[PDB]
Symmetry: C2
Subunit: 302 residues, 2 copies
C-alpha cells in the first residue's frame, strides 16, 4: 500500500466502459526521485530531470496511465490542476509543477478511441487521498492485460497492485505497479497465474512457446509493466536511481519474458528529502524488488 509512506496520496480515474484510466501518486512531502526505463518500447514525459546528473526537480506527483502515447496528455491535466492549487517550483512569475509519467498500451480492449486526456488527469488528482486505495482493474490498470503472444483475445486480465515491505528501525519500501506485461506472471512457487492461453483454454507458457518458434502476434510486434517504488528513508539522487534499477529485478522474478521489444517497462523511485531514516541502497533496492514482485501478484489476485 503505497500510501504507507509519509505524504503520499493516490487517486484513480477509471472508465470501466472504455476500459482505460490513469492513477496518480501525489507527494505532499518533498521527494528525491529516480527512474529506470528498461523496456524497449516506453513512452514517458519529464524523465530527464529524474537522472542523477540533472538538477533536483520539484516532483509534485507521478502518473501511471493507459492510452498508449496519447495518454501522456493526462499528465498535462495533472500539471494544470496543480498550478491552480498553487503547487510547483516557484519562479516568481509562476509556479511550475512536474508530473513525470509512463504509459501502457490498452487500446485493443474496450474503446480504442477513448484515452486519458486533460480532464481525466485532473479527475485523478481530485480523487487523490490518504489511506487504502482500490486495486485490480482500476485507474491505470483498468484496461491492463497479461500474456499477448497470441494477441489480446487469448490474454488474461492484468491490473494495478501494491505491497509494503517492512525492514528494521521503522523503515518501509512500498510499490504500486500496473501489470500489462507481454509475458506471463508466475507466483513464488513458479506456477503460471496469468498469461497467454491456448484456444483449448490452458496457459500456453509464453517462453516455452517462443523457444519452439511461435511468433509474437501482439499489435505492437511489428516495430509493459510500470510502477513506483517509494521509501521513508532519505536518499540522494544517485541512490534513488540505483533503487529504481534494482527494483527491475523484482519484475524479472515475477514476469517472463520481461523487457521485450513490445514492453515499455519503467520504474520510478522516491525517497524523502527530509527524514532521519537511512539504510544502504543495496538493501533498499532488494526490498524494492521484493515489493515490486509482490505488487505484480497483488494486481491479479483482485
Amino acid at each position: 500500500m503505497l500510501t504507507d509512506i509519509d505524504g503520499i496520496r493516490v487517486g484513480h480515474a477509471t472508465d470501466a466502459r472504455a476500459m482505460t484510466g490513469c492513477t496518480i501518486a501525489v507527494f505532499d512531502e518533498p521527494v528525491v526521485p529516480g527512474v529506470d526505463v528498461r523496456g524497449a518500447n516506453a513512452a514517458t514525459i519529464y524523465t530527464d530531470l529524474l537522472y542523477p546528473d540533472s538538477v533536483m526537480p520539484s516532483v509534485t506527483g507521478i502518473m501511471l496511465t493507459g492510452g498508449s502515447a496519447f495518454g501522456l496528455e493526462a499528465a498535462l491535466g495533472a500539471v494544470r490542476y496543480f498550478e491552480e492549487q498553487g503547487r510547483g517550483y516557484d519562479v516568481g512569475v509562476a509556479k511550475i509543477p512536474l508530473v513525470p509519467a509512463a504509459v501502457i498500451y490498452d487500446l485493443s480492449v474496450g474503446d480504442a478511441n477513448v484515452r486519458p486526456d486533460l480532464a481525466m488527469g485532473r479527475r485523478a488528482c481530485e480523487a487523490a487521498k490518504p489511506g487504502p486505495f482500490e486495486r485490480g482493474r482500476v485507474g491505470g490498470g483498468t484496461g491492463a492485460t497479461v500474456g499477448k503472444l497470441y494477441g489480446v483475445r487469448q490474454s488474461s486480465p492484468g491490473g494495478l497492485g501494491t505491497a509494503t515491505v517492512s525492514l528494521y528501525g521503522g523503515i518501509k519500501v512500498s510499490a504500486m505497479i500496473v501489470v500489462n506485461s507481454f509475458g506471463d506472471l508466475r507466483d513464488t512457487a513458479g506456477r503460471i497465474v496469468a498469461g497467454a492461453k491456448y484456444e483449448g483454454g490452458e496457459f500456453a507458457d509464453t517462453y516455452a512457446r517462443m523457444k519452439l518458434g511461435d511468433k509474437n502476434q501482439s499489435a505492437l510486434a511489428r516495430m509493459t509493466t510500470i510502477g513506483i517504488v517509494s521509501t521513508n528513508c532519505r536518499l540522494t539522487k544517485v541512490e534513488a536511481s540505483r533503487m529504481a534499477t534494482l527494483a527491475h529485478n523484482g519484475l524479472a522474478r515475477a514476469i517472463c519474458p520481461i523487457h521485450t521489444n513490445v514492453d515499455g517497462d519503467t520504474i520510478f523511485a522516491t525517497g524523502l528529502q527530509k527524514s532521519d531514516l537511512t539504510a544502504p541502497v543495496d538493501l533498499l533496492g532488494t526490498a524494492a524488488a521484493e515489493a515490486a514482485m509482490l505488487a505484480c501478484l497483488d494486481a491479479v489476485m483482485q
Copy 2:
C-alpha cells in the same frame, strides 16, 4: 534551411503578444531518429524511443516549443492532429503518431500565463510547408533570450535559426536551432554577438564575470537552453543517428559559453532517412552537424 532535406516541412505558431510559440518539423519521408539530452534542466517527451536500444518508432514530427514544462501540451496537440490525418504506426484499431519535443523557458518575457497548448500545436502542424521558412523571433523562438547572468532584463534577444552544410555527392546536413541560452553567443573570431549586457548596453562577458565571482541571477538559478534538430539526407542506423546528435553538441560548444549549465535544457534531435542511396561515415556527418548547428545559432540572432 532544414527543408533542404527531402521530405521535411516546417510550420510555426507565433504569439507575438504573449511572446511564446512552437515550431514543428514534419517528416513526410520516414526517418531514423536519435537524441542527446546534455543540459541539466531539460523537459522532453517521447525521447526514450529515440535511443539505440529502443525499437524503431514511427516519428511523425519533432517539435521545439516555448512554455517551459507546460509547453509539451503542444506536442500532444500535434499528436491529435496527425491521428486525425491518418498518420502514425498502424495498430489495427488505431494509428499512433509520435511527436518528440523539448522546451525552452520563456515565461519571464511577455505573459507568463500563456503557453503553447493543444490548439497551438495543431496550428503549427496546419502551417507546416516545404521551402524557405521564417527565422528570428518566431515559432519556438518567439520568446527566446540569450545571456541571463543578470536576469532577463539585461539579456539579448534569442530566436530560431537554420543552416545547411553541403558535402560531396549531393549529401546535405541541415540544422534548426532555438537559442535561449544562459550563456553568450560568439562568432568564429570569439566576438560576443549576443549575451548578458550591463545596464547601459555593453556586453559584460558572462564567463569572465563568473570567474570573478558574479552569481547567476536567472529565474531557474535556485535549483542546483538551446534545442534543435539536425537532419541529413543520408541513410543512418539508430546508433548512427544518436552519434550524430552527440557530435552536434560540439557545434553548440563552439558558439555558446557557458553551455550545458544547470539552468540549460540543451537537447539535440538528429534524423536520417530510412530509404536513401546516400551514405557517409557518421563521424564526418557528425562534424558537419556541429558546423550546421553552430551556423544556425548565429542565424538565430542575426535574423
